[PDB]
């Protein structure tokens, strides 16, 4: 018949091929699918919710829900400060967004945060949120933290400040630390001691290449 | 503030989270006929109000069944063993102005939850009791129950990301009310509803609340479930 | 490693079918040939779940419901004669199982085998979506029997078969100790409902029994 | 020649495969085929032949011809009752319409049930047939079997009585009970106890999918 | 289990080639290499029919007349030397038959058969509608002598062929018992004139007779 | 299926062949080709080069 000739790699099995399997139920025919709500086409969709971001993980809090309280009411010391790149990073690692990216060796893209001011609806304050570039050093003052990159966040106006860091890769990195502009005003029948929740996503659209194993499962 | 009612339910409210962007809507064969209520059934149920301490992990209710006792959906359910409904959740929380807080109202379809000391089972009345909730743990505990330890709410997740699901925040500053619509979530088109749990309404305290000495020590959170598109199996011959 | 300009803009290896289907190891068995005519050592098993190790069952359930063909390649080698065939055959959730290697189960004509002798290709047989519903369910919040009896959690909808692995021949002159790797692969897989990851370690492969595990890794205070 | 390379599954026997088997007689030329009558293209051509059903299957009377008789002519209990599936039922299971069943797992529709009064002429009652969805209990008295779905089926006028039974699948089904609403009023001629014939076959169309052996067989 | 919504509407698996059309081990049976030079086993017969194991002879039982080409696939093994090669040779049912493992039967010409080496891929030989009539009965109500003779129920219409299978090595060193496994498959099958169901158990492959059984499972009232 | 014979030559493994490779990784999208200056197309594009020619190679 048709001459034919096997070349090298006849035989084998690839574990990572696309060929036609050989059916064993051809007689069968499989239930119509019906429309099931919510349905997920990309992974992607799942980085771009946001999701509460553990910032006061410190070594007695991850156990219970502290560890997303953000504790706001010394003007000299940050509110928080954390690396901004949501591999090997203890605060963004467990994240939607974070956990999405630990099955991929290479993603770039960039990600926004959501700072949700969880206070009284009479308590009146200032933060100044400040982000330095990824070679940066972080500001050790208010005033240097002026100086860069900033936004006097009113809480008594607005109780949600929405960022988007760009140039998050990985194949060093950000800061997003936050600063006392003003104490938080509060006349007296409301409580003084206030928390800030916040939230990370993709905040236009995220890439990501090489498909791994995670490393948290055993 | 609109004055929503159905049937003979009316509440007085004041945006909707459409759960995955789909609106309930009915299934649409003579070998199987659905019957459709419509009449009653789409009622407003107001829960028993629970009180929001300094000190609440949380709350979680299960449904469809959570309305067993609830009068005609709650009778439908011991004659007909198959349904699928809708459920529009209204959760308000009618706070002061001096009060601060903030809750995670997520709805989590199928969420099966994880006994407290594991190689056991739980004796199924510790995942629900009808109208009243199951409250959550700050620590972990130990017994044939449910592990109701948040930071694991009940299925070993972390419950900071539990916002991938159909959900709202109750934020006592800005907001009060929160609304979400279920448009019954399964793999099958009719199920029964004693057997299976479609979703869990949790509510979970992110912020704690608070307040000084003169306030009163807790904040009401009413829960109120309409049966939307409810519909049946057919008991009459073909 | 230094941080390089990462620059390019795709999403095709995030899709889920460039996510769900990869061919993974599911199953090591081993099985003899001869002696103990009443032994359960002469043949496998492998009941086919999606719950059967921990890196792929973390994949399965970043979705509730999903439906997909299921297409797996075994790999058989042999230790210690003539030339080997094997025989895995492949129950339906409805289907006769054997007991001994020697059942009459073996021959039953709606139950579809391959014969597989040695030095070929590895063998591969396909299996299409078997469930009874409209997609396979990863979590079920429900109870088997009704009116809350045991067994809670599982259900019969997300039954996938066995699969039933011997050798063919009936006895040799010296032992013959074979080993099979099943691989089993999704294809053509759709997927509802997104799911928060999984944060605490499995313990048990039919439950979601967990132990209370920390959020995240602890640092030493909120600003460093 | 052509350059091709075995996948897996090359050489290897599956059983259920459609491939294009080399005939071993090619010379050969068969048999004209002539028009036999009553052909079969499906096997549900078979369910939807009417069949009888032995509701009188008791302990003695399985061997003969008594199994198919109800015996009618105490109104406190019914006549006869049966589970409404054709699998895993003593009544319904010989049927042709569970016979034909039983070689699948999966199946699904409706299935219809006729009731042949084979009594005299003069012979004139009610007799009350209900049917309780696949959740209910059965009806324990003749008023709760008459407050649920039933047909009061008159005797004296109409000798062969309908249904059509839905939701009849498997992958706790119905009741078919039959009261007596009136005894059996019969003339000084006629004989006093009658009988009455049951049929099952498949209502309008039934589905079925997946094939297995049958457990009857040995 | 539980009762699902079981929703879909489906005929194809319920049509005759998608009942009929499985393959089913019928045969399986040893034969020699060497010794016993005029002896019976050597060599196999089978000849071939639809009453050869009762799971598929009731499926053919449904069914008066049917008409089918037969394509088996043999899956042969060995055990205890050189590569064997085998040979099946199928007799049409006007043929000769071989009497010994070297009778000249084996070289006719008009008796087609596979030489398959062991190692490669099944062999498969494929027969075609062979009878004399428009179809095969599976029940025949009548005599095979005229005048009502001996032999009931024995027609020579639906007579298929035989299947002679052999070793062609002519000798070997040590003893080679090898097995054979005949999967029959009907394919482009039509069948006329439906049947009740077999209800009492077979008792012979050349016969109809059976025991008197009872029509269904006793229960203990007519209304419970 | 199609009546097929190998030919001489069939499973061996010629060194100097161009038969498609099988892809180890099909899912996985290359990085995108960016223009980098001064592309080589021939070898003889180095040929063309000047270059000085040491001619007083003497021995020391």
């Known amino acids: 018949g048709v001459p034919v000739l096997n070349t090298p790699g006849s035989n084998q099995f690839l574990t990572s091929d696309d060929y036609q399997s050989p059916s064993a139920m051809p ?7 019906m429309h099931i709500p919510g349905e997920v086409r990309n992974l992607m969709e799942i980085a771009e919710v946001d999701s509460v971001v553990p910032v006061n993980n410190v070594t007695g809090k991850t156990k219970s829900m502290d560890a997303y309280q953000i504790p706001v009411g010394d003007k000299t010391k940050p509110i928080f400060s954390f690396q901004m790149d949501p591999g090997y990073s203890s605060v963004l ?5 974070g956990e999405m990216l630990n099955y991929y060796a290479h993603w770039s893209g960039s990600v926004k945060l ?27 003052s208010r005033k240097d933290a002026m100086l860069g990159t900033h936004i006097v966040w009113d809480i008594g106006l607005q109780s949600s400040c929405v960022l988007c860091v760009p140039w998050i890769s990985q194949s060093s990195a950000g800061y997003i630390t936050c600063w006392y502009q003003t104490n938080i005003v509060v006349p007296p029948g409301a409580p003084t001691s206030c928390d800030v929740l916040c939230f990370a996503s993709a905040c236009n659209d995220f890439s990501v290449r090489l498909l791994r194993d995670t490393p948290f499962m055993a | ?11 007085t409210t004041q945006n909707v989270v459409v759960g995955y962007g789909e609106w309930p809507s009915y299934l649409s064969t003579a070998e199987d006929q659905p019957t459709q209520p419509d009449v009653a059934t789409c009622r407003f149920y107001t829960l028993e109000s629970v009180q929001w301490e300094k000190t609440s992990p949380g709350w979680w209710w299960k449904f469809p069944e959570a309305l067993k006792n609830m009068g005609l959906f709650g009778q439908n359910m011991h004659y007909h063993y198959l349904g699928r409904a809708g459920y529009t959740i209204h959760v308000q929380c009618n706070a002061s102005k001096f009060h601060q ?21 739980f004796p199924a009345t510790e995942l629900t009791t009808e109208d009243t909730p199951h409250v959550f743990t700050s620590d972990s505990i130990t017994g044939k129950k449910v592990q109701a330890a948040v930071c694991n709410a009940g299925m070993g997740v972390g419950v900071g990301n539990l916002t991938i699901f159909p959900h709202q925040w109750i934020n006592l500053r800005t907001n009060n009310s929160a609304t979400i619509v279920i448009p019954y979530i399964n793999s099958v088109p009719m199920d029964n509803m004693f057997r299976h749990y479609n979703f869990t309404l949790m509510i979970i305290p992110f912020a704690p609340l608070n307040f000084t000495d003169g306030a009163t020590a807790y904040v009401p959170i009413t829960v109120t479930i309409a049966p939307m598109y409810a519909e049946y199996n057919g008991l009459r011959l073909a | 490693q230094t941080r390089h300009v990462v620059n390019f803009h795709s999403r095709s290896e995030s899709t889920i079918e460039n996510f769900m289907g990869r061919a ?41 419901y999903m439906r997909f063909d299921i ?38 004509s709606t139950n579809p085998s391959v014969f597989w002798t040695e030095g070929n290709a590895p063998p591969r047989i396909s299996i299409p979506f078997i469930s009874v519903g409209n997609a396979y369910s990863s979590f079920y919040d429900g109870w088997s029997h009704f009116t809350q009896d045991g067994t809670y959690g599982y259900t019969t909808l997300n039954a996938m078969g066995k699969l039933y692995i011997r050798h063919v021949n009936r006895s040799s002159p010296h032992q013959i100790t074979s080993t099979i790797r099943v691989y089993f692969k999704p294809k053509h897989i759709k997927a509802w409902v997104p799911r928060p990851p999984r944060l605490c370690p499995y313990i048990n492969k039919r439950d979601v029994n967990f132990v209370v595990t920390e959020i995240t890794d602890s640092r030493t205070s909120i600003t460093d």
Chains 1, 4 share one sequence.
């Open chain 1, 27 to 33: 007689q069968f025919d499989e239930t119509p699918e």
């Open chain 1, 93 to 97: 690692k467990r994240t939607l967004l």
């Open chain 1, 114 to 140: 959501t700072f949700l001011f969880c206070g009284s609806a009479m308590a009146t304050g200032k933060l100044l949120i400040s982000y330095s570039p990824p070679g940066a050093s972080v500001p050790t």
């Open chain 2, 1 to 11: 503030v609109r004055s929503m009612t159905l049937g003979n339910s009316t509440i």
């Open chain 2, 101 to 121: 807080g903030c809750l995670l109202v997520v709805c989590v379809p199928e969420a099966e939850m994880g006994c407290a000391d594991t190689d056991t089972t």
């Open chain 3, 24 to 64: 993974a190891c599911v199953f090591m068995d081993q099985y003899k040939i001869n002696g103990e005519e009443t032994s359960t050592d002469r043949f496998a098993v492998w009941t086919i779940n999606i719950r059967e190790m921990a890196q792929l069952r973390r994949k399965c359930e970043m979705f509730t």
């Open chain 3, 71 to 108: 297409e797996m390649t075994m790999v058989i080698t042999s230790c210690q004669m003539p030339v080997l065939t094997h025989q895995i055959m492949y129950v339906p959730p409805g289907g006769p199982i054997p007991a001994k290697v020697d059942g009459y189960e073996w021959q039953t």
